[PDB]
DNA sequence: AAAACGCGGGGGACAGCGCGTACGTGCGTTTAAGCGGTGCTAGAGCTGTCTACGACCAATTGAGCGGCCTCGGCACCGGGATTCTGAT
DNA sequence: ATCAGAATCCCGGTGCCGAGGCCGCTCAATTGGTCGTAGACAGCTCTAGCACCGCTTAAACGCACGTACGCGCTGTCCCCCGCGTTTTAACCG
């Protein structure tokens, strides 16, 4: 299938259980794929812009970290 | 000693809507807006240069900064005319 | 305390420690032998590292 | 005047000053301030366009902070480009919840 | 004739979206900001423009919070707003330190 | 003396916010939330003044305290 | 351990980046950062959504719950 | 060494070097790097202490993402400092 | 090659606060990125403040104000105190 | 001009009670995916040469800022027309 | 289905303050030149993260079943509206 459906219903389930959800409605899953989709569009857009500026043909973890830091969620662990 | 984008907002308005004006307080809002957008774009250009080990904020850094601040329906037209300005400057 | 013992032998005779209080107050800026030699060095000023 | 020679209406020299004294990098390229002036000019023109159209639709020939607020918020995009911004003495868009109506 | 409960409430809503002048009463806000800054520094000093900026950002905060609170009640099939609605709005927003 | 931000004031601010009905306890809780926000902005403002050595908060220092909390204010200088 | 599922996430990321650029070539660390960030976002959002359901007197989250969470966050 | 004479564990000299090379200002005061290194050392010491305490509570000699994230999130102080931050491989409270 | 990281210094602080505990490559990377984030934030605040005061130099009082704004509170006093001890002891020697 | 009290009153909260769609929960399949292992070779990441680019410095001047001064235009009012609203 | 009674709304009248123009001379702009050195460019060595394939097996899919809860409906009774009336704090010279 299309890889947006790759994020499986059990994966959405485990995410919800971690966040404290007791029960998940069948309509939840499509929209979780949607919000995941739009967030990835944003972060990948900034990352690809960073590479294009850098004349680098390879997205880099520093680029991802910088993109996330601008969007407002700094990511620690992949610094360099 | 105050420094502002007064005459420039006036010149743009009188160029594009000649029948309208800009109040003092509307001008204050607009001055803050221009200063804020300038600060955001320039700060992003500086951060891009620091990331890239770059000691110059070139038109390319400003390119990336504008394309990366203005998210959609902007920085297509804005980039096109920005490049137009830089190009015909270099011509002239 | 070793310094104040080397100065004022009779601990019961508080007067010497009392008059010494400014000295130990203002000399706390150094607390190590190497730093003290080095401070004599800063005042030596013999173009030294 | 670099503003004239670059065909802009904003100050090339001034944006060059500000890029200097902001300490944004050790050096500033020749073309960068002209590009930044162009971007600032065009953002200025577009937000002023929305403001002037709001004023005309308000039958009213003057930009006041409410007019700037509508110019910002009514556009689906500038609303969230300035979403963290608060325009002073601009109200809010007249929206009312549909369930919160007499029926 | 006796107006039924709700229509003048809509009327005030429409009036206050049409209007734009500030709405928190300005001298009480002067006193509140003065006594709130007192606890952070004795012999402290304010000017009119600074107090205006505080009052106006304050008004922005409260209108945004009331957007969220109203909308939360509407999601909860609720037309009134309740302290629980405000608390939820804030704690999703993250300002509940 | 918290009552300066009065019941009609909170009421009208809610009506600007599109609220149709307001529970009674909203007024007290709203004043509390207002106090918290005010503490947050005054702390940064007075810090900026202490930086300037002055006593008087400038509108610039207000704007900078507000821009610290990611809520930029426009019109009061820049 | 991580729960958004590795290779599916990588392919999803690949086709998302395909639209923004061609012959674009990720790094393993970049993919890990992307997955971890998306995991954190989604766990936060489900926490918000469950708050929303619990306030609406519901145990099972719903579409309206997640849209409430989003349009109070502000990206929507 | 400036750090060794300072009795702080952080490099005052390299902090000064980066403050110069970071386009932060044309000149940097002598005490600014020192103060910044002191605050960095203090925050690192606080977080590492909390992480070690979490590891002891978990009966583990090894400080892992879950220890660090659990420290930051349990502690209200660091929680409000890094609320809008995410720790890699870090679990939920 | 010479890599820009706060490895040895975080090790030193960790042995000082918990001599038995150790930290691995990944967790050192977490600490390094965290310290870089905090340090970038403080330095950016200091530069912005020097700018808004029209002062073209950076110093311990700049960093005073930056730390006091950034750290939420009840470590603000501690960070200020340890930074101040560092800077007075600097200005002595 | 606004806030503050008070009264009756309508509207809606909150709780209870029922039913049925929807949910979670096994039951094992089929699926795909770590976690190895293959062979690349794009493209780093790094160095070295040399040019145009940019940073400083006088010398020259013309755009901007503050001050000053008019008068359109907006807010304001009363009075007049518009209007959406039950109420019976 | 109907029209009375408040609020909203149209126009235009007069008054005042700020916008927008003008003027001077301040200050930084704009040539013009020089020097140093940052980047573009060229070139090399070597990383590393493709593309896929084993293989085991955890996990996902599909289906079927039972029942806890979503949503609706009804009922009562607390808790606000929406005035009118009476204080009250504030209003700007």
Author numbering:
A (entry chain b): 23 to 102
B (entry chain d): 30 to 121
C (entry chain B): 295 to 343
D (entry chain c): 16 to 118
E (entry chain e): 39 to 135
F (entry chain f): 25 to 102
G (entry chain a): 59 to 134
H (entry chain g): 16 to 108
The publication says:
To investigate the structural basis for Chd1 and FACT function during Pol II nucleosome passage, we formed a Pol II−Spt4/5−nucleosome complex in the presence of Chd1, FACT and the transition-state analog ADP-BeF3. Additional density was observed for Chd1, but not for FACT, and was fitted with the structure of Chd1 in its post-translocated state26. The structure shows that Pol II adopts the active post-translocated state and has transcribed 27 bp into the nucleosome, as observed biochemically. At this stage, Pol II has unwrapped 45 bp of nucleosomal DNA, exposing the proximal histone H2A−H2B dimer. Spt5N interacts with the exposed proximal H2A−H2B dimer, likely stabilizing it when DNA is absent. The structure shows that Chd1 binds the partially unwrapped nucleosome. Chd1 uses its double chromodomain and its ATPase motor domain to contact the nucleosome at SHLs +1 and +2, respectively. In contrast, the DNA-binding region of Chd1 is not observed in our structure and apparently mobile. However, in the structure we present here, the second DNA gyre is no longer available for Chd1 interactions because DNA corresponding to SHL −7 to −5 has been transcribed by Pol II. Displacement from DNA is predicted to release the inhibitory effect of the DNA-binding region and thereby activate Chd1.
